[PDB]
């Protein structure tokens, strides 16, 4: 018992929780989140991931495979899922290579974003403790824009490739690299460190903006919504997709991970567990940054809204001013970012993992010749480097935004959890997969999962999609900035060579398989034993 | 859910083949899962089969695992046991009980049916 | 398969006494899995217990059960004599299921 629970504790939590969540929540306005968010918590969210577990479970085999057993006109789901992971691991490390970076920097008797004596800095600055008495700035958010990201005027402008970054990049890819191959994981009694240090350090960091003197406004912004008029398309998608990106449902590395599990388990009781302290850590670190940020704004005599990047810099911009003010700064500046990185990479692990077996067992006869997955590792990695490079140029902070707001997130994961609950729910039959999840856990769905299926999770699915086209509205990192429409179409590129992977395979397999065109509907639509 | 009645108890020759019945009624018998439990002269219970609320899963004891199939009407709200080849042993009161949750146990049982051999 | 063993094949009891039944079986099974069965004399046998402590709808407050792994129980606070009747515990972890000998109050 307590040895599972450790384990359901430390594996699922990740930079889901302590990176996206805050910044997508600043992004839209603070409470008005909330009430979208556990709107497809429940009624989507906990029914969809429940439900990835048991198809990985009941398949005993991958995304590609158990779709084959399922539903075989619908297999392209697995592609889908396998792409929309390659996508996320392209640009998820990114955010590895920012820690590190800070972490490196840590190395100093004073933080270099405590004051603005160095070179890097705008004659703009103010000290932050000064500005109370423009267009003053200060100095964690020009550290953050000019020594780290070194960010040039827009998308068109990449400019240089930042060598340092670059290197951090290398760095964590050849950990990864090295961890995969020879099979590394936190499984020994390394793990009571590693499970537990996540949680300590949120502790901490939440005891230090909650006694902040500012951390009152910041809690009011966060919890009092906006009912009346924050309700435009964007958050509806930014809420359902937060939930389906932080579970990594679509993703399908859940189906390995229900596979891999024994089959005589309460499945159920588990995956409830699981989710409800995943939503539980995120909207509790949202107590940590959105108190820092009252903290900033009582200090500084903006508005909430405006003392920080609503871009993925949020993170990066608020726990380095928390740990700015704590006992001996550099000490806790460094066990933050080691946190972070562990945090990070039990994530990175997953899904590299995910992938490689995923993408082997659509080709096993190659790619299962001995060192042929050795070699194969090294490919993948050295692929994700190239393209992760893109993002680390002066104008990199752009593309990544565009990857984290298109690739692994937003409509397409609403595309794919669509097809997955409308064919299970409705080709498939929901009354089959009572009958196969009785089988398995030894009682049926019940009422919530059956109607949350067939019913709750298609209409918010498609409404979410359909209003989002009715009242379109571009991206636009922090605030003030607009994408060209170039970057707009490699967006929706990203997303639609993620999404078309259903369509495409469908009609393949329509063509591929001879016979009368509802002989060869029928054949591909009935399930395999 | 209320009720459960067996018919289609009584002797047959050793050898030979009979088939029970279990009707039901109060509630859908199309979304529960049956079992037969058999009962010897000494009050011994034993399980016999199990067919999943769909028909697609069956399981069998193995003193009967190639003599008796199960099967089911979901229409009528009827359940069957075709015994093919009786032995000896055989000899029971037949009760059909209704088991969908196995965490739950068997949550209703029916008045059963005598079957003899001689 | 899993046989399950009852030890007090029968007992004698009088009205007011605390009683109490054990179950065996030859492999562990989970306390999720485990059900206790009333059958009064010349009767259908009816739900008692199930997941080990929980009582069915019908069942008096007095009844209680305990158990895990290999070896399950039920007591009696306090015997009536309604409770007059046999009682077998079964597992409901892996086919084939399987019923305990079965224990009978005789008075």
């Known amino acids: 018992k307590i040895d599972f629970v450790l384990s359901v504790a430390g594996g699922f939590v990740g930079l889901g929780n302590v990176w996206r969540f805050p910044y997508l929540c600043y992004k839209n306005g603070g409470g008005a989140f909330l009430i979208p968010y556990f709107i497809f918590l429940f009624g989507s969210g906990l029914p969809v991931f429940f439900l990835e577990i048991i198809i990985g479970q009941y398949t005993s085999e991958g995304g590609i495979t158990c779709w084959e057993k399922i539903c075989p006109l619908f297999s392209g789901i697995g592609y889908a899922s396998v792409v929309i992971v390659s996508l996320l691991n392209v640009y998820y490390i990114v955010i590895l290579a920012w820690a590190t970076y800070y972490l490196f920097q840590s190395f100093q008797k004073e933080l270099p974003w405590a004051h603005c004596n160095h070179s890097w800095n705008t004659p703009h600055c103010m000290e932050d403790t000064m500005r109370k008495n423009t267009n003053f700035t200060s100095p964690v958010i020009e550290f953050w824009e000019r020594n780290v990201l070194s960010l040039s005027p827009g998308i068109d402008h990449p400019g240089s490739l930042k060598w340092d970054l670059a290197l951090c990049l290398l760095l964590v890819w050849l950990v990864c690299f090295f961890c995969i191959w020879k099979g590394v994981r936190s499984t020994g009694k390394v793990v009571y460190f590693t499970a537990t240090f996540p949680f300590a350090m949120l502790l901490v960091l939440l005891v230090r903006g909650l006694t902040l003197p500012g951390a009152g406004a910041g809690i009011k912004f966060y919890l009092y919504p906006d009912i009346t008029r924050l309700e435009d398309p964007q958050v509806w998608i930014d809420a359902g997709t937060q939930i389906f990106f932080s579970y990594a449902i679509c993703l399908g590395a859940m189906t390995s991970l229900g596979s891999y599990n024994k089959y005589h388990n309460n499945v159920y009781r588990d995956c409830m567990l699981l989710g409800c302290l995943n939503s539980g850590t995120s909207f509790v670190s949202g107590f940590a940054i959105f108190s820092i940020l009252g903290f900033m704004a009582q200090e500084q005599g903006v508005d909430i809204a405006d003392v920080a990047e609503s871009g993925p810099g949020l993170a990066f911009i608020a726990y380095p001013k928390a740990v700015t003010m704590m006992p001996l700064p550099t000490f806790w500046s460094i066990l933050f970012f080691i946190m972070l990185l562990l945090l990070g990479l039990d994530s990175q692990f997953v899904e590299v993992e995910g992938q490689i077996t995923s993408l082997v067992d659509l080709y096993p006869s190659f790619l299962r010749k001995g060192y042929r997955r050795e070699i194969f590792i090294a490919f993948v990695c050295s692929i994700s480097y190239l393209l992760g490079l893109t993002m680390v140029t002066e104008g990199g902070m752009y593309v990544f935004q565009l990857f984290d707001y298109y690739a692994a997130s937003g409509v397409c994961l609403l595309w794919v959890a669509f097809f997955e609950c409308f064919v299970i729910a409705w080709i498939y039959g929901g009354n089959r997969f009572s009958e196969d999840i009785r089988d398995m856990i030894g009682f049926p769905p019940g009422p919530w999962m059956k109607y949350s299926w067939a019913v709750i999770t298609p209409v918010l699915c498609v409404g979410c999609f359909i209003f989002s086209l009715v009242k379109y509205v571009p991206l636009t990192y922090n605030k003030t900035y607009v994408y060209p429409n170039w970057a707009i179409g490699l967006g929706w590129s990203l997303a639609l060579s993620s999404m078309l992977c259903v369509p495409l395979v469908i009609v393949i397999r329509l063509c591929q398989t001879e016979g009368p065109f509802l002989v060869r509907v029928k054949y591909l639509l009935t399930p395999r034993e | 859910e209320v009720q459960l009645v067996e018919s289609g108890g009584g002797l047959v020759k050793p050898g030979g083949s009979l088939k029970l019945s279990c009707a039901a009624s109060?509630?859908?018998?199309?979304?529960?899962?049956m079992s037969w439990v058999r009962q010897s002269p000494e009050k011994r219970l034993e399980w016999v089969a199990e067919i999943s609320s769909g028909g697609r899963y069956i399981y069998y004891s193995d003193t009967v695992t190639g003599r008796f199939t199960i099967s089911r009407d979901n229409a009528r709200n009827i359940l069957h046991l075709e015994m093919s080849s009786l032995r000896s042993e055989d000899t029971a009161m037949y009760y059909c009980?209704?088991?969908?949750?196995?965490?739950?146990?068997?949550?209703?049982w029916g008045q059963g049916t005598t079957l003899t051999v001689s | 398969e899993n046989v399950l063993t009852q030890s007090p094949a029968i007992m004698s009891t009088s009205p007011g006494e605390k009683v109490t039944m054990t179950c065996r079986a030859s492999s562990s099974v989970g306390s999720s899995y485990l059900h206790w069965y009333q059958q009064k004399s010349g009767a259908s046998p009816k739900l008692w217990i199930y997941s080990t402590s929980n009582l069915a709808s019908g069942v008096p407050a007095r009844f209680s059960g305990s158990g895990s792994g290999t070896s399950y129980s039920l007591t009696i606070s306090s015997v009536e004599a309604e409770d007059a009747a046999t009682y077998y515990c079964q597992q409901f972890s892996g086919y084939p299921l399987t019923f305990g000998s079965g224990t009978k109050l005789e008075m």
């Open positions: 109060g509630f859908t018998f199309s979304s529960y899962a």
């Open positions: 009980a209704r088991g969908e949750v196995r965490q739950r146990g068997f949550d209703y």
